[PDB]
């Protein structure tokens, strides 16, 4: 949590990864995807105070630069804990604070070993993502096979 | 896959990993977990057929040995594809063939890095898993923090 070549360089990727359009323009919606995609849990309001924040043209689009500036500021409210607790929260479907010790084990080793961060990113790229960040999990299977 | 030492050793782990009773016997339920814990997607019937075959006393129990023998048989019946697909299915909450490109990325890298395959088992070992394998993720959160 401190703007640095790497930090930034990374922040680009995530931004590039969810700009379906293909031209540096993350939508209010694409914005959330980006953040969750980094461990943050932006509230629908929070994502709003962010669009209006800078963008005063109501274009609803966000330029990497703006994004970067935002992140930098909101970076203070990011500690290892929340990030972690979000990962595990993906495995909590019904949302009961409870998760499959199993599903965990499986996803983490089986799929955690067959793939490398870079590979995860490469897939998501060619992958067919929509606004929300949804993707037909089969697409991934076809790739991985 | 075949019954190589490593393989046996792996099954042992998983089996040991969900025999909450502390001894060397897993229940029909526990069985389910163990299997999901390895990418197998056991059907209730299948699970019952197993508890039935061996253990004619229908004790509902099953030894590592019996377990080993069993897995051996169903072994050549499962292929890498299925496991892959089951992994991804964890990420598909409402079960609509769709998952969060984000959540994937997040879980896969953030938490995919903070832990090593063993660190996972080691955690689930000390973790407070219940019958269905359910676990309070917070408990994992703490261990991590």
């Amino acid at each position: 949590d401190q703007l640095t070549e790497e930090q930034i360089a990374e922040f680009k990727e995530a931004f590039s990864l969810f700009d379906k359009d293909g031209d540096g323009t993350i939508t209010t919606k694409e914005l959330g995807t980006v953040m969750r995609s980094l461990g943050q849990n932006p509230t629908e309001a929070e994502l709003q105070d962010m669009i209006n924040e800078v963008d005063a043209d109501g274009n609803g689009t966000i330029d990497f630069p703006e994004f970067l500036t935002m992140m930098a500021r909101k970076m203070k409210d990011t500690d290892s804990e929340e990030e972690i607790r979000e990962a595990f929260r993906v495995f909590d479907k019904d949302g009961n604070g409870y998760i499959s010790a199993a599903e965990l084990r499986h996803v983490m080793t089986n799929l955690g070993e067959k793939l490398t961060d870079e590979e995860v990113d490469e897939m998501i790229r060619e992958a067919d993502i929509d606004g929300d960040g949804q993707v037909n999990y089969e697409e991934f299977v076809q790739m991985m096979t």
Side-chain angles (χ1 to χ4, degrees), chain A:
Chain A
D1 33 64
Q2 224 73 293
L3 270 180
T4 70
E5 305 230 2
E6 184 176 302
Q7 231 324 290
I8 307 168
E10 288 163 298
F11 260 129
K12 269 284 191 194
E13 173 83 64
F15 180 89
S16 171
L17 264 185
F18 301 123
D19 176 17
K20 45 200 292 281
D21 252 54
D23 34 66
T25 37
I26 276 45
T27 60
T28 175
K29 222 171 193 180
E30 275 167 302
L31 183 57
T33 295
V34 189
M35 304 192 73
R36 317 231 184 58
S37 145
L38 282 172
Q40 307 203 221
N41 196 186
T43 90
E44 192 66 68
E46 213 162 293
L47 287 180
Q48 225 46 76
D49 293 309
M50 281 186 219
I51 291 296
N52 297 163
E53 182 59 286
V54 179
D55 177 26
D57 332 69
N59 283 46
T61 24
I62 288 304
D63 225 331
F64 186 75
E66 275 157 291
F67 176 52
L68 194 39
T69 298
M70 285 178 278
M71 291 304 96
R73 210 160 64 253
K74 199 152 300 298
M75 193 162 319
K76 308 169 61 168
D77 302 343
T78 300
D79 59 324
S80 302
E81 197 154 85
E82 308 180 26
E83 302 204 332
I84 280 315
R85 191 200 305 307
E86 266 311 315
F88 289 121
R89 198 163 298 183
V90 175
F91 294 91
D92 188 1
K93 302 134 180 60
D94 73 308
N96 56 187
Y98 279 124
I99 71 162
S100 172
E103 289 192 344
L104 208 251
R105 242 261 296 207
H106 179 53
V107 167
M108 289 311 312
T109 78
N110 250 301
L111 206 49
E113 180 191 314
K114 308 176 187 310
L115 297 173
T116 79
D117 278 344
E118 185 154 54
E119 313 201 75
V120 168
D121 269 10
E122 299 178 1
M123 280 184 281
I124 304 176
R125 301 194 74 88
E126 64 178 48
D128 193 351
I129 300 68
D130 62 326
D132 299 1
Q134 288 294 56
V135 68
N136 182 315
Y137 76 63
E138 266 310 302
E139 305 213 18
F140 293 167
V141 162
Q142 193 65 93
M143 276 168 228
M144 301 201 66
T145 40

